[PDB]
Amino acid sequence: DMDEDEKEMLSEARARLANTQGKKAKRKDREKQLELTRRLSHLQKRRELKYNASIPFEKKPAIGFYXXXXXXXXXXXXXXXX
Amino acid sequence: RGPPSPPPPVLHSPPRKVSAQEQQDWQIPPSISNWKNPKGYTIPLDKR
Amino acid sequence: EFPSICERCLGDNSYVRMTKEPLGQECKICSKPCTIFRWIKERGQKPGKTQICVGCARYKNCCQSCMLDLQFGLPIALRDAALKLVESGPTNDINREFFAQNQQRLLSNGETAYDSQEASAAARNLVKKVEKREXXXXXXXXXXXXXXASLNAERADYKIRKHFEQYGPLKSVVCSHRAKCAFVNFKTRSSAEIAAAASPDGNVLKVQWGKXXXXXXXXXXXXXXXXXXXXXXXXXXXXXXXXXXXXXXXXXXXX
Amino acid sequence: NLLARQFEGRHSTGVAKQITKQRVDSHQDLELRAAVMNDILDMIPEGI
Amino acid sequence: XXXXXXXXXXXXXXXXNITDLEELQEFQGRKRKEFEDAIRRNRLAMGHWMRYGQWELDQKE
RNA sequence: GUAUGUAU
RNA sequence: UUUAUACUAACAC
RNA sequence: AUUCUCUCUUUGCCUUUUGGCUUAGAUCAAGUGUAGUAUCUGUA
Ligand SMILES: [Zn+2]
């Protein structure tokens, strides 16, 4: 009993020192783990069955000093990247 | 709210020379508590 | 400080009585408080009303009621798609509030006008852009099915309606572009018989007597009829299409 | 006052909190811990 | 057994994509939400800013 | 097993 | 069938 | 001779220390027993 009870407290202490996350850390990560796990089932349903809209806030470059040719090549490149 | 009126030229006086001894003389040792040491971050007893 | 308002809505009369109301509806686009301006056009007409705030109908440039663009007379959506002049594009619930507020932020500070020369140059350019873009064995096998009122138009809808309606009383008309066919059904057989002989080998045609997975099968039938029309004008896919063409007729005859 | 709340809703987050006894000890500090954030910024030379 | 009471905690703790054109925009959209939020949390904090641009060039430009 | 949020 | 842990706990003294 | 990568030696740079403030903000490990469910261990 006495040898056994010393070994119990020596293992409980290794848990205390090891983790500092608290209640909010553990509950916040489970929310990530649920959401991530939820998708993997939800995306398989899509294969089984088988801000973007308009920019957040534009802020134009600056002023026409030099720039029309630069924009011409940029439009077609996004289609290739897709 | 919308974005501000674009800023002006800064026009500072010329930056003074610093040296490596000066930038060491402003060395700030991270302080550590007797009481409030939250999270983990273990520190040996010879650094207290 | 009367409103934008075009000439078109104010109406026939020269003298016009109208009432302001300093804080009616917040503007649709802008989504902020503005002034409603009400007036009558004609004798027993239901009275007008400005729908936009001036801040916006500056930027957008239109009759604060009619919303027809001032220069031309076409709608504002119709204008932005075709001419693509100012190239605005929020079309959201919330982003369109700020975007349209941002243009009111732009024009108020630096008065960037709506240049009409470059605008008109876009139109005359678009006008020119439009112009540059622009049998015995049958009737026997047909008569065999007729003895034992719909015509299959093999080899656009409005023209298919125009050319067939003028040859008799129509029951209904169809089309499928992917199918590339249209089943013209007549009210009488006398018309459908007459329309068959009239529209045989005509431009706008094979005029016979009519009889995920569905998308891929119909898209496969499009590539089959495309190579079928191309060959007659003039190899493994052509042979594979012939095997598929033979397999469909066997299912049609058996069923 | 209650009707205007019912056909407008409450204004932007801010207005002004007007201290009181509950939040005096807190708001005392907040200022001290932003008048040391001042004095350091100015005590530290031009590139350290 | 003093230094061994700490090191035994570390070793114990130590032991313990994309298809289509449509599904990528969902993935690409949610990362935009992520970034925009971190800006609202911290007006200034250039790490979150700089990152956000880099990320957009690689995707779009 | 609610206070409080997530999904249809 | 035995032992441990948690969940049952919206239990009971 | 220059540039790029890998390896070793000596030296430099940090993230604020895990958001802040109070009366260290505040108090002190006798719980046990049964029933059901889930997981793990052994029986040429
Ligand atoms: Zn408006």
Coordinates of C-alpha atoms (C1' of nucleotides) and ligand atoms in Angstrom, one line a residue:
Chain A
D1 CA 0.0 0.0 0.0
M2 CA 2.7 2.5 1.1
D3 CA 5.0 1.7 -1.9
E4 CA 1.9 1.7 -4.2
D5 CA 0.6 5.1 -2.9
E6 CA 4.0 6.7 -3.4
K7 CA 4.0 5.6 -7.0
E8 CA 0.5 7.1 -7.6
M9 CA 1.4 10.6 -6.4
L10 CA 4.6 10.4 -8.5
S11 CA 2.5 9.8 -11.7
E12 CA -0.2 12.4 -10.8
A13 CA 2.6 15.0 -10.4
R14 CA 3.9 14.2 -13.9
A15 CA 0.5 15.2 -15.3
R16 CA 0.3 18.5 -13.4
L17 CA 3.7 19.6 -14.6
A18 CA 3.1 18.5 -18.2
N19 CA 0.0 20.5 -19.1
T20 CA -1.0 24.1 -18.7
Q21 CA -3.8 24.4 -21.2
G22 CA -6.8 24.9 -18.9
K23 CA -10.6 24.3 -19.5
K24 CA -10.8 26.8 -22.3
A25 CA -7.9 25.3 -24.3
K26 CA -9.3 21.7 -24.1
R27 CA -12.9 22.8 -25.0
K28 CA -11.7 25.0 -27.9
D29 CA -9.6 22.2 -29.5
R30 CA -12.5 19.8 -29.3
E31 CA -14.6 22.3 -31.2
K32 CA -11.9 22.3 -33.9
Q33 CA -11.7 18.5 -33.8
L34 CA -15.5 18.2 -34.2
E35 CA -15.7 20.7 -37.0
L36 CA -12.8 19.1 -38.9
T37 CA -14.3 15.6 -38.3
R38 CA -17.7 16.9 -39.4
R39 CA -16.3 18.0 -42.8
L40 CA -14.6 14.7 -43.6
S41 CA -18.0 13.0 -43.3
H42 CA -19.7 16.0 -45.1
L43 CA -17.2 16.0 -48.0
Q44 CA -17.6 12.2 -48.5
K45 CA -21.4 12.9 -48.9
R46 CA -20.6 15.3 -51.8
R47 CA -18.4 12.7 -53.6
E48 CA -21.1 10.0 -52.9
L49 CA -23.8 12.2 -54.4
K50 CA -21.5 13.1 -57.3
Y51 CA -16.0 37.7 -48.9
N52 CA -15.1 36.1 -52.3
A53 CA -18.2 37.6 -54.0
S54 CA -16.8 41.1 -54.6
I55 CA -13.6 41.8 -52.6
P56 CA -13.8 43.1 -49.0
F57 CA -12.5 46.7 -49.3
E58 CA -10.7 47.9 -52.4
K59 CA -7.8 50.4 -52.0
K60 CA -6.5 51.3 -55.5
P61 CA -2.8 51.3 -56.1
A62 CA -1.9 55.0 -56.4
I63 CA -1.8 57.0 -59.7
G64 CA -1.1 56.7 -63.5
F65 CA 2.6 57.6 -63.8
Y66 CA 3.7 54.6 -65.9
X67 CA 0.6 50.5 -66.5
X68 CA -2.1 49.1 -68.7
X69 CA 0.1 46.3 -70.1
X70 CA 0.7 44.9 -66.6
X71 CA -3.0 44.3 -66.0
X72 CA -3.5 42.5 -69.4
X73 CA -1.2 39.6 -68.6
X74 CA -2.5 39.3 -65.0
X75 CA -6.1 38.4 -66.0
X76 CA -5.3 35.3 -68.1
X77 CA -2.8 34.0 -65.5
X78 CA -5.5 33.4 -62.8
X79 CA -7.3 31.0 -65.2
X80 CA -4.1 29.0 -65.7
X81 CA -3.6 28.9 -61.9
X82 CA -7.1 27.3 -61.5
Chain B
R1 CA -15.1 54.1 -41.0
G2 CA -13.2 54.9 -44.2
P3 CA -9.4 55.2 -44.7
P4 CA -7.5 58.4 -43.7
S5 CA -6.0 61.1 -45.9
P6 CA -2.6 59.7 -47.2
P7 CA 0.3 60.6 -45.0
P8 CA 3.0 63.3 -45.5
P9 CA 6.9 63.3 -45.8
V10 CA 8.6 62.5 -42.5
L11 CA 11.6 64.7 -42.8
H12 CA 13.5 63.6 -39.7
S13 CA 17.0 64.8 -38.6
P14 CA 19.7 62.4 -39.7
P15 CA 19.8 59.1 -37.6
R16 CA 22.5 59.1 -35.0
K17 CA 25.1 56.4 -34.7
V18 CA 24.3 53.8 -32.0
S19 CA 27.2 51.3 -31.4
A20 CA 27.0 47.7 -30.2
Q21 CA 27.8 48.6 -26.6
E22 CA 24.9 51.1 -26.4
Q23 CA 22.4 48.5 -27.8
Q24 CA 23.7 46.1 -25.2
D25 CA 23.4 48.7 -22.4
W26 CA 19.6 48.7 -23.0
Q27 CA 19.4 44.9 -22.5
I28 CA 16.2 44.1 -20.6
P29 CA 16.3 40.9 -18.6
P30 CA 12.9 39.2 -18.7
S31 CA 11.6 39.5 -15.2
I32 CA 10.0 36.5 -13.4
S33 CA 7.6 36.4 -10.5
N34 CA 7.6 35.1 -7.0
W35 CA 3.8 34.5 -7.4
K36 CA 2.2 35.1 -10.8
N37 CA 3.8 32.5 -13.1
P38 CA 0.8 31.3 -15.1
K39 CA 0.7 28.6 -17.8
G40 CA 3.7 26.3 -17.5
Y41 CA 7.1 27.6 -18.3
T42 CA 9.3 25.8 -15.7
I43 CA 12.3 27.7 -14.4
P44 CA 15.2 26.2 -12.4
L45 CA 15.6 27.2 -8.7
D46 CA 19.1 28.7 -9.4
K47 CA 17.3 31.3 -11.6
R48 CA 15.3 32.7 -8.6
Chain C
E1 CA -32.0 71.8 -54.9
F2 CA -34.5 69.7 -56.9
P3 CA -33.5 66.2 -57.9
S4 CA -31.8 64.4 -60.7
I5 CA -34.9 63.3 -62.6
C6 CA -34.7 62.8 -66.4
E7 CA -36.9 64.7 -68.9
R8 CA -38.7 61.4 -69.7
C9 CA -40.7 61.1 -66.4
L10 CA -41.5 64.7 -65.7
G11 CA -43.8 64.4 -68.7
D12 CA -45.8 66.3 -71.2
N13 CA -46.5 69.5 -69.2
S14 CA -44.0 72.3 -68.7
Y15 CA -45.1 73.3 -65.3
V16 CA -44.8 70.7 -62.6
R17 CA -45.9 70.7 -59.0
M18 CA -44.0 68.4 -56.7
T19 CA -43.4 67.9 -53.1
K20 CA -40.2 67.1 -51.2
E21 CA -40.0 65.2 -47.9
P22 CA -36.6 65.7 -46.2
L23 CA -36.2 62.2 -44.7
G24 CA -38.2 59.5 -46.4
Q25 CA -36.7 56.1 -47.4
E26 CA -33.0 55.4 -47.0
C27 CA -31.7 54.8 -50.6
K28 CA -31.8 51.3 -52.0
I29 CA -28.2 51.1 -53.1
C30 CA -26.6 53.7 -50.8
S31 CA -28.7 52.4 -47.8
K32 CA -28.7 55.8 -46.0
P33 CA -31.3 58.5 -45.3
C34 CA -32.4 60.7 -48.2
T35 CA -35.2 62.9 -49.6
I36 CA -38.3 61.7 -51.4
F37 CA -39.6 63.7 -54.2
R38 CA -43.1 63.1 -55.4
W39 CA -45.0 64.3 -58.5
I40 CA -47.7 63.5 -61.0
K41 CA -47.0 62.9 -64.7
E42 CA -50.4 62.8 -66.4
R43 CA -54.1 63.2 -65.8
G44 CA -55.1 60.0 -63.9
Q45 CA -51.6 58.6 -63.6
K46 CA -50.3 57.2 -60.3
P47 CA -47.7 59.6 -59.1
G48 CA -43.9 59.3 -59.4
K49 CA -41.2 59.0 -56.7
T50 CA -37.5 59.1 -56.6
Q51 CA -36.0 55.7 -55.5
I52 CA -32.3 56.6 -55.2
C53 CA -30.2 59.1 -53.2
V54 CA -28.5 61.8 -55.3
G55 CA -25.1 60.7 -54.0
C56 CA -25.6 57.4 -55.8
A57 CA -27.4 58.7 -59.0
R58 CA -24.3 61.0 -59.4
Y59 CA -22.0 57.9 -59.5
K60 CA -24.4 55.6 -61.4
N61 CA -25.7 58.5 -63.6
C62 CA -29.4 58.0 -64.0
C63 CA -32.9 59.4 -63.6
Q64 CA -33.4 59.1 -59.9
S65 CA -36.8 57.4 -60.7
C66 CA -36.5 55.8 -64.1
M67 CA -32.9 54.6 -63.7
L68 CA -32.5 54.7 -67.4
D69 CA -29.1 56.0 -68.2
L70 CA -29.2 59.7 -69.2
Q71 CA -27.1 59.5 -72.4
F72 CA -28.6 56.4 -74.0
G73 CA -32.0 55.4 -72.5
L74 CA -31.1 51.7 -71.7
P75 CA -31.3 50.2 -68.2
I76 CA -28.4 50.5 -65.8
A77 CA -27.7 46.7 -65.5
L78 CA -28.0 46.3 -69.3
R79 CA -25.5 49.2 -69.6
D80 CA -22.8 47.9 -67.2
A81 CA -22.7 44.4 -68.7
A82 CA -22.5 45.4 -72.4
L83 CA -20.5 48.7 -72.4
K84 CA -18.4 47.8 -69.3
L85 CA -17.5 51.5 -68.8
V86 CA -17.1 52.1 -65.0
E87 CA -17.0 48.4 -64.3
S88 CA -18.8 48.3 -60.9
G89 CA -19.4 45.0 -59.2
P90 CA -20.6 44.5 -55.6
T91 CA -24.2 43.1 -56.1
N92 CA -24.3 42.0 -52.4
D93 CA -26.4 42.9 -49.4
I94 CA -23.6 44.4 -47.3
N95 CA -20.6 44.9 -49.7
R96 CA -22.8 47.0 -52.0
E97 CA -23.4 49.4 -49.0
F98 CA -19.7 50.2 -48.6
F99 CA -18.6 49.9 -52.3
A100 CA -21.3 52.5 -53.2
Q101 CA -20.4 54.5 -50.2
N102 CA -16.7 54.3 -51.3
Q103 CA -17.6 55.8 -54.7
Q104 CA -19.5 58.6 -52.9
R105 CA -16.2 58.9 -50.9
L106 CA -14.3 59.1 -54.2
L107 CA -16.4 61.5 -56.3
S108 CA -17.1 64.0 -53.4
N109 CA -13.4 64.5 -52.6
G110 CA -12.0 64.4 -56.2
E111 CA -14.7 65.3 -58.7
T112 CA -14.2 62.5 -61.3
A113 CA -16.8 63.2 -63.9
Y114 CA -18.6 60.7 -66.3
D115 CA -16.8 61.4 -69.5
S116 CA -19.2 61.2 -72.4
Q117 CA -16.8 61.2 -75.4
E118 CA -15.1 58.0 -74.2
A119 CA -18.5 56.6 -73.3
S120 CA -19.8 57.2 -76.8
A121 CA -16.6 55.7 -78.2
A122 CA -17.4 52.5 -76.3
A123 CA -20.9 52.3 -78.0
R124 CA -19.8 52.8 -81.7
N125 CA -17.1 50.2 -81.0
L126 CA -19.7 47.8 -79.6
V127 CA -21.9 48.3 -82.7
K128 CA -19.1 47.2 -85.1
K129 CA -18.2 44.4 -82.7
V130 CA -21.7 42.8 -83.4
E131 CA -21.5 42.8 -87.2
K132 CA -18.1 41.0 -87.3
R133 CA -19.3 38.1 -85.2
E134 CA -22.2 37.5 -87.6
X135 CA -34.9 12.4 -99.6
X136 CA -36.9 10.0 -101.7
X137 CA -36.0 7.1 -99.3
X138 CA -37.1 9.4 -96.4
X139 CA -40.6 10.1 -97.6
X140 CA -41.2 6.3 -98.4
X141 CA -40.1 5.1 -94.9
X142 CA -42.0 8.2 -93.6
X143 CA -45.2 7.2 -95.4
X144 CA -44.9 3.7 -94.0
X145 CA -45.0 5.1 -90.5
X146 CA -47.8 7.5 -91.4
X147 CA -50.1 4.7 -92.5
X148 CA -49.2 2.5 -89.5
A149 CA -48.8 15.2 -86.8
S150 CA -45.2 15.7 -85.5
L151 CA -42.1 16.5 -87.6
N152 CA -38.5 15.8 -86.4
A153 CA -36.4 18.8 -87.4
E154 CA -32.9 17.4 -87.6
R155 CA -29.7 19.2 -88.7
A156 CA -33.0 29.3 -83.3
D157 CA -36.3 28.6 -81.5
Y158 CA -37.9 31.8 -82.7
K159 CA -36.9 31.0 -86.3
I160 CA -38.1 27.3 -85.9
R161 CA -41.4 28.9 -84.6
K162 CA -41.5 31.4 -87.5
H163 CA -40.9 29.0 -90.4
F164 CA -43.3 26.2 -89.1
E165 CA -46.2 28.4 -87.8
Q166 CA -46.6 29.9 -91.3
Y167 CA -47.4 26.4 -92.7
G168 CA -50.3 25.5 -90.4
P169 CA -51.9 25.5 -87.0
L170 CA -49.2 24.5 -84.4
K171 CA -49.9 22.3 -81.4
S172 CA -46.5 22.8 -79.8
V173 CA -42.8 23.2 -80.6
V174 CA -39.6 22.0 -78.9
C175 CA -35.9 22.3 -79.0
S176 CA -32.7 21.0 -77.4
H177 CA -29.4 22.6 -78.3
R178 CA -27.3 19.7 -76.9
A179 CA -29.8 17.4 -78.6
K180 CA -29.7 19.7 -81.6
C181 CA -33.2 18.8 -82.6
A182 CA -36.8 20.1 -82.4
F183 CA -40.1 18.2 -82.6
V184 CA -42.7 20.4 -84.3
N185 CA -46.2 19.1 -83.5
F186 CA -49.2 20.4 -85.6
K187 CA -52.9 20.6 -84.8
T188 CA -53.7 18.8 -88.1
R189 CA -51.9 16.2 -90.2
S190 CA -52.8 18.1 -93.5
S191 CA -50.5 20.9 -92.3
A192 CA -47.8 18.6 -91.0
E193 CA -47.8 16.7 -94.3
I194 CA -47.6 20.0 -96.2
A195 CA -44.9 21.4 -94.0
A196 CA -42.8 18.3 -94.5
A197 CA -42.6 18.7 -98.2
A198 CA -42.1 22.5 -98.0
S199 CA -39.3 22.5 -95.4
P200 CA -37.4 19.4 -96.9
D201 CA -33.7 20.4 -97.6
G202 CA -34.1 24.1 -96.4
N203 CA -31.9 26.5 -94.5
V204 CA -32.9 28.8 -91.6
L205 CA -33.0 20.6 -92.6
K206 CA -33.9 16.9 -92.2
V207 CA -37.7 17.0 -91.8
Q208 CA -39.0 13.5 -91.0
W209 CA -42.1 12.2 -89.2
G210 CA -41.6 11.9 -85.4
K211 CA -41.8 8.9 -83.2
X212 CA -25.4 13.3 -64.4
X213 CA -26.1 10.2 -66.6
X214 CA -28.7 11.9 -68.8
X215 CA -26.3 14.8 -69.2
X216 CA -23.4 12.6 -70.3
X217 CA -25.5 10.5 -72.7
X218 CA -27.0 13.6 -74.4
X219 CA -23.6 15.3 -74.6
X220 CA -22.3 12.0 -76.2
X221 CA -25.2 12.3 -78.8
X222 CA -24.0 15.8 -79.5
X223 CA -20.5 14.7 -80.5
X224 CA -22.1 11.9 -82.6
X225 CA -24.4 14.3 -84.6
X226 CA -21.5 16.8 -85.0
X227 CA -19.2 14.2 -86.7
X228 CA -22.3 13.0 -88.6
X229 CA -22.8 16.4 -90.2
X230 CA -19.0 17.0 -90.7
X231 CA -18.5 13.7 -92.5
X232 CA -21.4 14.1 -95.0
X233 CA -19.9 17.5 -96.0
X234 CA -16.5 15.8 -96.7
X235 CA -11.5 7.2 -87.3
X236 CA -11.8 5.0 -84.2
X237 CA -14.2 7.5 -82.6
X238 CA -16.2 7.6 -85.8
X239 CA -16.4 3.8 -85.8
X240 CA -17.2 3.8 -82.0
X241 CA -19.9 6.5 -82.7
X242 CA -21.3 4.3 -85.4
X243 CA -21.6 1.4 -83.0
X244 CA -23.4 3.7 -80.5
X245 CA -25.6 5.0 -83.4
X246 CA -26.5 1.4 -84.3
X247 CA -27.2 0.5 -80.6
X248 CA -29.7 3.3 -80.2
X249 CA -31.8 2.3 -83.3
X250 CA -31.9 -1.3 -82.0
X251 CA -33.3 -0.1 -78.7
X252 CA -35.8 2.2 -80.4
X253 CA -37.1 -0.6 -82.8
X254 CA -37.2 -3.3 -80.0
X255 CA -39.1 -1.0 -77.6
Chain D
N1 CA -36.6 57.4 -25.7
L2 CA -38.0 53.9 -25.7
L3 CA -39.7 54.3 -29.1
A4 CA -36.5 55.6 -30.7
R5 CA -34.8 52.5 -29.4
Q6 CA -37.5 50.4 -31.1
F7 CA -37.2 51.9 -34.6
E8 CA -33.5 52.4 -34.6
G9 CA -31.6 50.2 -32.2
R10 CA -28.7 51.2 -30.1
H11 CA -25.9 53.4 -31.5
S12 CA -22.3 52.3 -32.2
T13 CA -20.2 50.7 -29.5
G14 CA -18.6 53.5 -27.5
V15 CA -20.7 56.4 -26.3
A16 CA -18.9 56.7 -22.9
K17 CA -18.8 54.6 -19.7
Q18 CA -18.6 57.3 -17.1
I19 CA -16.5 55.6 -14.4
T20 CA -18.5 55.1 -11.2
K21 CA -17.2 53.2 -8.1
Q22 CA -17.2 49.7 -9.6
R23 CA -14.7 50.6 -12.3
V24 CA -12.3 53.1 -10.7
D25 CA -9.6 50.8 -9.5
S26 CA -9.4 49.2 -12.9
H27 CA -9.4 52.4 -15.0
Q28 CA -6.8 54.0 -12.7
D29 CA -4.3 51.3 -13.6
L30 CA -5.2 51.3 -17.3
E31 CA -3.9 54.9 -17.4
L32 CA -0.7 54.2 -15.4
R33 CA 0.0 51.2 -17.7
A34 CA -0.3 53.7 -20.6
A35 CA 1.8 56.5 -19.1
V36 CA 4.6 54.0 -18.6
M37 CA 4.1 52.9 -22.2
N38 CA 4.7 56.6 -22.9
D39 CA 7.7 57.3 -20.8
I40 CA 9.6 54.2 -22.0
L41 CA 9.0 54.9 -25.7
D42 CA 10.6 58.3 -25.0
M43 CA 13.4 57.1 -22.6
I44 CA 14.5 54.6 -25.3
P45 CA 16.9 56.2 -27.8
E46 CA 16.5 56.4 -31.6
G47 CA 17.2 52.8 -32.5
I48 CA 17.4 50.1 -29.8
Chain E
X1 CA 14.8 11.5 -8.7
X2 CA 14.3 15.4 -9.2
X3 CA 15.5 16.0 -12.7
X4 CA 13.8 12.8 -13.8
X5 CA 10.4 14.0 -12.5
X6 CA 10.4 16.7 -15.2
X7 CA 11.9 14.9 -18.2
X8 CA 9.5 12.0 -17.8
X9 CA 6.6 14.5 -18.4
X10 CA 8.0 15.7 -21.7
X11 CA 8.5 12.2 -23.2
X12 CA 5.0 11.2 -22.1
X13 CA 3.5 14.3 -23.7
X14 CA 5.7 13.8 -26.8
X15 CA 4.3 10.3 -27.7
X16 CA 0.7 11.6 -27.1
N17 CA -6.7 17.1 -50.4
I18 CA -9.0 19.3 -52.5
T19 CA -10.8 18.4 -55.8
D20 CA -12.9 20.2 -58.4
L21 CA -13.1 24.0 -59.1
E22 CA -16.1 24.5 -56.8
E23 CA -14.9 22.8 -53.6
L24 CA -11.6 24.8 -53.6
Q25 CA -13.5 28.1 -53.5
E26 CA -15.1 27.0 -50.2
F27 CA -11.7 26.1 -48.9
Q28 CA -10.3 29.4 -50.3
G29 CA -13.2 31.4 -48.8
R30 CA -12.9 30.1 -45.2
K31 CA -9.2 31.0 -45.2
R32 CA -10.2 34.5 -46.1
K33 CA -12.6 34.6 -43.2
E34 CA -9.8 33.4 -40.9
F35 CA -7.5 36.2 -42.1
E36 CA -10.1 39.0 -42.0
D37 CA -11.0 38.1 -38.4
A38 CA -7.3 38.3 -37.2
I39 CA -7.2 41.8 -38.6
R40 CA -10.3 42.8 -36.6
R41 CA -8.8 41.4 -33.5
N42 CA -5.6 43.5 -34.1
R43 CA -5.8 46.7 -36.2
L44 CA -2.0 46.7 -36.2
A45 CA 0.1 43.6 -36.0
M46 CA 2.0 43.4 -39.3
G47 CA 2.6 39.6 -39.2
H48 CA -1.1 39.0 -39.8
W49 CA -1.1 41.7 -42.5
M50 CA 2.0 40.6 -44.5
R51 CA 0.9 37.0 -44.4
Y52 CA -2.5 37.9 -45.8
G53 CA -1.0 39.4 -49.0
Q54 CA 1.6 36.7 -49.7
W55 CA -1.3 34.1 -49.4
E56 CA -3.4 35.9 -52.1
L57 CA -0.6 36.2 -54.7
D58 CA 0.1 32.4 -54.7
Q59 CA -3.6 31.8 -55.2
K60 CA -4.7 34.7 -57.4
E61 CA -2.5 37.8 -57.8
Chain F
rG1 C1' -28.3 19.1 -18.6
rU2 C1' -29.9 24.5 -17.9
rA3 C1' -27.4 29.2 -18.2
rU4 C1' -24.9 29.6 -23.6
rG5 C1' -23.8 28.7 -28.4
rU6 C1' -23.1 25.1 -33.4
rA7 C1' -26.1 22.2 -37.5
rU8 C1' -31.0 21.0 -40.4
Chain G
rU1 C1' -16.3 -14.5 -15.0
rU2 C1' -12.4 -10.8 -12.7
rU3 C1' -9.7 -5.8 -12.3
rA4 C1' -9.2 -0.4 -13.5
rU5 C1' -11.0 4.3 -15.7
rA6 C1' -14.7 7.5 -17.5
rC7 C1' -19.5 8.2 -18.9
rU8 C1' -23.9 7.4 -17.3
rA9 C1' -25.8 11.6 -12.2
rA10 C1' -30.7 15.0 -15.3
rC11 C1' -29.6 9.2 -8.2
rA12 C1' -29.8 8.4 -2.8
rC13 C1' -28.3 8.7 2.2
Chain H
rA1 C1' 38.6 34.9 -59.4
rU2 C1' 33.1 35.1 -58.5
rU3 C1' 28.1 33.0 -57.4
rC4 C1' 24.8 28.9 -55.4
rU5 C1' 24.1 24.4 -52.1
rC6 C1' 25.8 21.0 -48.2
rU7 C1' 28.9 20.0 -43.4
rC8 C1' 31.6 21.8 -38.9
rU9 C1' 33.6 25.6 -35.4
rU10 C1' 33.0 30.7 -33.0
rU11 C1' 29.7 34.9 -32.4
rG12 C1' 24.7 37.9 -33.1
rC13 C1' 18.8 38.2 -33.1
rC14 C1' 14.4 37.7 -30.9
rU15 C1' 8.3 35.9 -29.2
rU16 C1' 7.2 39.8 -24.1
rU17 C1' 6.6 34.6 -20.1
rU18 C1' 1.3 32.2 -22.0
rG19 C1' -3.3 39.2 -22.4
rG20 C1' -4.7 43.2 -17.6
rC21 C1' -6.8 44.7 -11.9
rU22 C1' -8.2 43.6 -7.0
rU23 C1' -8.7 41.4 0.2
rA24 C1' -1.6 36.4 -2.2
rG25 C1' -9.3 38.3 -5.7
rA26 C1' -11.2 33.9 -2.0
rU27 C1' -11.5 29.2 0.6
rC28 C1' -9.4 23.5 1.7
rA29 C1' -8.8 17.2 -0.4
rA30 C1' -13.4 11.8 4.8
rG31 C1' -16.7 10.4 0.8
rU32 C1' -18.7 5.8 0.3
rG33 C1' -22.2 1.9 -1.7
rU34 C1' -25.3 -0.3 -5.5
rA35 C1' -27.4 -0.7 -10.7
rG36 C1' -26.7 0.1 -16.2
rU37 C1' -23.7 1.4 -20.6
rA38 C1' -18.7 2.2 -23.3
rU39 C1' -13.3 1.2 -23.8
rC40 C1' -8.7 -1.6 -22.3
rU41 C1' -6.0 -6.0 -20.0
rG42 C1' -5.8 -11.3 -18.5
rU43 C1' -8.3 -16.5 -18.4
rA44 C1' 15.3 -26.9 -65.7
Ligands
ZN1 ZN -28.4 56.8 -52.2

